[PDB]
């Protein structure tokens, strides 16, 4: 139940300094006051992050880091897949008052997939057809999300942090606690961010970055929380 659109809100992408964000807990094993070196997919330090102010189609590759400085939970939905049609499995993710709402199957998405809000809200028009599937799962601010697909497991890590600065990414460090694991394997190569609500949304900003395999050194405090992270393949000082 969707139509086309005339106002092409196509804007050039901005570029931002990544700084030292994008750290999650690699293993679920507690540790105390240690310095542990581990290699995995991460967001390299002091990289550049693509800033987006319809919504284009972006590659997924190894992993995706998605950040949003929002007020009152603006960004809601996520579309994942390779062909984004009924030929190949697609993933729909919806954020609500609960944790997550996940559907895993082939749907039909148009050029302008959006949920729609009614002003008590009752509207869903992101897709049009539902053929078959089995996997359904139900459970001022800065929200950080890491999306990974490793050896048949889909992992979403999430974190929320109160922020007051507007433009730049905070110069702070906070690990990403794990949120959701799905023991289902898909070969996703592309993803898209859902629109909100003719639709009226121009100040919908988000940061997108990519992850690569490399090695980090992590410091665990006495309470089992990560306080410092040091890159290896960055500087002659860091390698030492």
């Amino acid at each position: 139940q969707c139509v086309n659109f005339t106002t092409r809100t196509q804007l050039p992408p901005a570029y931002t300094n990544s700084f030292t964000r994008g750290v999650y807990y690699p293993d679920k094993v507690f540790r105390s006051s240690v310095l542990h070196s581990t290699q995995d997919l991460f967001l390299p330090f002091f990289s550049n992050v693509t800033w987006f102010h319809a919504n284009p189609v972006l590659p997924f590759n190894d992993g995706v880091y998605f950040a949003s400085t929002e007020k009152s939970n603006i960004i809601r939905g996520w579309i994942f897949g390779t062909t984004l049609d009924s030929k190949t499995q697609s993933l729909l993710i919806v954020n609500n008052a609960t944790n997550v709402v996940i559907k895993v199957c082939e749907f039909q998405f148009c050029n302008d997939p959006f949920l729609g809000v009614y002003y008590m809200e009752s509207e869903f028009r992101v897709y049009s057809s539902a053929n078959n599937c089995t996997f359904e799962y139900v459970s001022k601010n800065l929200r950080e999300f890491v999306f990974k697909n490793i050896d048949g497991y889909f992992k979403i890590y999430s974190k929320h942090t109160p922020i007051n600065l507007v433009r730049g990414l905070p110069q702070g460090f906070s690990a990403l606690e794990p949120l959701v694991d799905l023991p289902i394997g898909i070969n996703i190569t592309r993803f898209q961010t859902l629109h909100i609500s003719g639709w009226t949304a121009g100040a919908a900003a988000y940061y997108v970055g990519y992850l690569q395999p490399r090695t980090f050194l992590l410091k665990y405090n006495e309470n089992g929380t990560i306080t410092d992270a040091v890159d290896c393949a960055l500087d002659p000082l860091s390698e030492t």
């Binding site: 679920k28 094993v29 048949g152 023991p183 089992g224």
Partner: protein, 366 residues
């Protein structure tokens, strides 16, 4: 004498063997286990569909205890080909498919790999390499009616047989002869579907029989559905072997005050040695320490002089000694636990060094 491989031993201390406190019992602790597969609506439904329109059900992402299903004595026919029933709770595949229908009593055997028949070739076909189980139980008291149950139909006429796991719902008029029919019966045109005539007065083999076939499929996706995995109780202050949610280790378990974040499961300290585990059931953080082990040593004044010796257990507390369970007065020292030698108040030169500043000598042995 054995270790030295000699018939004479001079004065001194030697090392013979080692000991370790053996574990007492076995404890396994597992999650609470939930999400039973919905087989109640499959095996105890209000009704089943026809054989040529067999009902198909998908079972995935749940737990299915086949022990209770096998223990049911209400099943007249219970034939498993892929695996033995006793091993159903052990091995499992990624998902289960259930095909439920109703057939006549004599046709129960027709639902089998490499079998031919009206049902086996026009209603439902089973692959020769079929794995799973087939369950046929009488439903005369439910499906059959005194007035004649015509609600169930079966296909009888078709030019070609049915493929494995294929269902036909076509109502096209069968044309045995060469004369075409425009959807009407005639000289050589007959209805491929015939209605069943199940009645209570019918004898054994004619009563309605509900048949459910479970086929287990093992696509590369991880397995989700099979039998439950048993859980046991917990003990403390008695080192045993434990299997906490797949983590296997031996040691003694005590209360720990360390704090886990709500997403960890088991900590460690260094060199990847487990040091604290949270139980899957009550979600409490414990502490792990293996019971002490130590090399035993023999203090002897020499075979030539005497033949009584003293035993040293290195680096163990004098609380767990176990034939020398009692022997003589037992002394506890920093180096270990000494048995067979009495402790004195004097202080002489050193003869057979023991450690931690103390040593023994022959007077008995002091």
């Amino acid at each position: 004498k054995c270790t030295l491989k000699s018939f004479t031993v001079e004065k001194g201390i030697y090392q013979t063997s080692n000991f370790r406190v053996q574990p007492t019992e076995s404890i396994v602790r597992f999650p609470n286990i939930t999400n039973l597969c919905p087989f109640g609506e499959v095996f105890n439904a209000t009704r089943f569909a026809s054989v040529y329109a067999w009902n198909r059900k998908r079972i995935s992402n749940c737990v299915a205890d086949y022990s209770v299903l096998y223990n049911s004595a209400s099943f007249s026919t219970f034939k498993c080909y892929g695996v033995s029933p006793t091993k159903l709770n052990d091995l499992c595949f990624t998902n289960v498919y259930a095909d439920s229908f109703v057939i006549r009593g004599d046709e129960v055997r027709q639902i089998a790999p490499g079998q031919t028949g009206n049902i086996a070739d026009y209603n439902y076909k089973l692959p020769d390499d079929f794995t799973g189980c087939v369950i046929a139980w009488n439903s005369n008291n439910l499906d059959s009616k005194v007035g004649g149950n015509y609600n169930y139909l079966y296909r009888l006429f078709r030019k070609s047989n049915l493929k494995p796991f294929e269902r036909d719902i076509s109502t096209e008029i069968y044309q045995a002869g060469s004369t075409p029919c425009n959807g009407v019966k005639g000289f050589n045109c007959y209805f491929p579907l015939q209605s069943y005539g199940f009645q209570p007065t019918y004898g054994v083999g004619y009563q309605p029989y509900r048949v459910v076939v479970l086929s287990f499929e093992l696509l590369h996706a991880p397995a989700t559905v099979c039998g439950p995995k048993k859980s046991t109780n917990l003990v403390k202050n008695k080192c045993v072997n434990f299997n906490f949610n797949g983590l296997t280790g031996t040691g003694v378990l005590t209360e720990s005050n360390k704090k886990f974040l709500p997403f960890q499961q088991f900590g460690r300290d260094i060199a990847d040695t487990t040091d604290a585990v949270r139980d899957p059931q009550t979600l409490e953080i414990l502490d792990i320490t293996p019971c002490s082990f130590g090399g035993v040593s023999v203090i002897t004044p020499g075979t030539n002089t005497s033949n009584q010796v003293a035993v040293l257990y290195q680096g163990v507390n004098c609380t767990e000694v176990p034939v020398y369970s009692t022997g003589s007065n037992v002394f506890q020292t920093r180096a270990g636990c000494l048995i067979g030698a009495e402790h004195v108040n004097n202080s002489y030169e050193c003869d057979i060094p023991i450690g931690a500043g103390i040593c023994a000598s022959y007077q008995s042995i002091i």
